[PDB]
């Protein structure tokens, strides 16, 4: 399967910076969502789940085709709760009907991270919508109730290595688990709509307790009111993972730099970019624009 990036006709940096600003302006406006967390965390989760279907072996799945717009992927049990990120973006797609679905879902994730004061993420245009029959089947996204060997093995399919996996998981400092979506409940920290390295700090400094929640699932709970998933706590159980966790709890700039590279790579897996294709765009935030 080859998927070649095709820039939307005649579009350039300024067009996509207009779509960025539209998403970012609505993130500021619709602030009440999920008890004032706002839409940013569900939008970086949506960009991860449309990319996380990729399989390196046959180049199926991935962010290129925008296939989450089809019922099979929209109704995947693993995507429960992401309909709220879709409905947030649907106004903006009506306003810029020329951007492809893959591009709009991935730029929403980029915009949310930078607007929640994360690192800049280089983003590239050119994903092309593909037919309903290209939609990957349910079951390619990871279970939460498993251990470190499962996480390592699952992420080899998206060929991410240990460092990349640990840098990507730092995004679980954002938002929260919702019992009616996943059977898990609670936030992982106090700053859950500002991008920081707090996931790593909480993992190493809190007093975790294995408890059973109302959906009868086990999760790691702390006195402070935070929770960690079994696959999250996995990172301090494995010796290779645990020493990268310590590296990111001791250096927030290295965390930001490595997250930026692994999230771009995540979003680009499966796509062939021609050598005459434009460079990756670095978008300015509303704040850097005085907007």
Ligand X SMILES: c1cc[n+]2cc[nH]c2c1
- Using CB under 6 A as the criterion, which residues of the chain lie in contact with ligand HEM when the complex forms? 41-42, 44-45, 48, 81, 142, 144, 151, 168-169, 171-172, 174-178, 181-182, 184, 229, 231, 263
Residue 26 Cβ vs ligand X, minimum distance, rounded to whole Å: 22
Enumerate the H helices of 10-147 as residue ranges: 13-29, 33-36, 40-51, 71-74, 83-95, 101-115
Residue 11 or 176 having the CB closest to ligand X? 176
CB neighbour list of residue 93: distance below 8 Å, 6 or more residues apart: 99, 101, 104
Position with the least CB separation from ligand HEM: 175
CB atoms within 10 A of CB 201: 17
Contact 155, 236 (CB under 8 A): no
Residue 194 Cβ vs ligand HEM, minimum distance, rounded to whole Å: 13
Candidates 102, 170, 187, 270: give the one binding ligand X (CB under 6 A): 187
Give me the residues paired with residue 209 across strands. Answer: 221
Residue 84 Cβ vs ligand HEM, minimum distance, rounded to whole Å: 8
DSSP-derived secondary structure letter, 229: -
Strands of 161-269, DSSP E: 208-212, 218-222, 227-228
Residues 227-266 that bind ligand X (CB under 6 A): 227-229, 232
Contact 201, 251 (CB under 8 A): no
Residue 65 Cβ vs ligand HEM, minimum distance, rounded to whole Å: 20
CB neighbour list of residue 191: distance below 8 Å, 6 or more residues apart: 173, 198
Residue 182 or 222 having the CB closest to ligand HEM? 182
Considering CB distances under 5 to 8 angstroms, the limit depending on partner class, which of ligand HEM, ligand X, none binds residue 5? none
Residue 147 or 253 having the CB closest to ligand HEM? 147
268 in helix, strand or coil?
Answer: helix
DSSP-derived secondary structure letter, 142: P
Number of chain residues interacting with ligand X (CB under 6 A): 10
Residue 25 or 141 having the CB closest to ligand X? 141
Q: Rule CB under 6 A: say whether 177 interacts with ligand X.
A: yes
Q: Which residue ranges make up the site for ligand X (CB under 6 A)?
A: 172, 175-177, 187-188, 227-229, 232
């Amino acid at each position: 399967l080859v998927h070649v990036a095709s820039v939307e006709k005649g579009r350039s940096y300024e067009d996509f910076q207009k779509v960025y600003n539209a998403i970012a302006l609505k993130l500021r406006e619709d602030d009440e969502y999920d008890n004032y967390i706002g839409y940013g965390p569900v939008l970086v989760r949506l960009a991860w789940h449309i990319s996380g279907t990729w399989d390196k072996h046959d180049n199926t799945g991935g962010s290129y085709g925008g296939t989450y717009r089809f019922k099979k992927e929209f109704n995947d049990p693993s995507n429960a709760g992401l309909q709220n990120g879709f409905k947030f973006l649907e106004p903006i797609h009506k306003e810029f009907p020329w951007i492809s679905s893959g591009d709009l879902f991935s730029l929403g994730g980029v915009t949310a991270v930078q607007e929640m004061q994360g690192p800049k993420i280089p983003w590239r245009c050119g994903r092309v919508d593909t037919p309903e029959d290209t939609t990957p089947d349910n079951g390619r996204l990871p279970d939460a109730d498993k251990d470190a060997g499962y996480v390592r093995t699952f992420f080899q399919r998206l060929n991410m290595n240990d460092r990349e996996v640990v840098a990507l998981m730092g995004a679980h400092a954002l938002g929260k688990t919702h019992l009616k979506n996943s059977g898990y409940e609670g936030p992982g920290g106090a700053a859950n709509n500002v991008f920081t390295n707090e996931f790593y700090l909480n993992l190493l400094n809190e007093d975790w307790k294995l408890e059973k929640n109302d959906a009868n699932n086990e999760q790691w709970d702390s006195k402070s009111g935070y929770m960690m998933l079994p696959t999250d706590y996995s990172l301090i159980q494995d010796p290779k993972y645990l020493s990268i966790v310590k590296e990111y709890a001791n250096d927030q700039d290295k965390f930001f730099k490595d997250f930026s590279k692994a999230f771009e790579k995540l979003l680009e897996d499966g796509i062939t970019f021609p050598k005459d294709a434009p460079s990756p765009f670095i978008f300015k935030t509303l704040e850097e624009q005085g907007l």
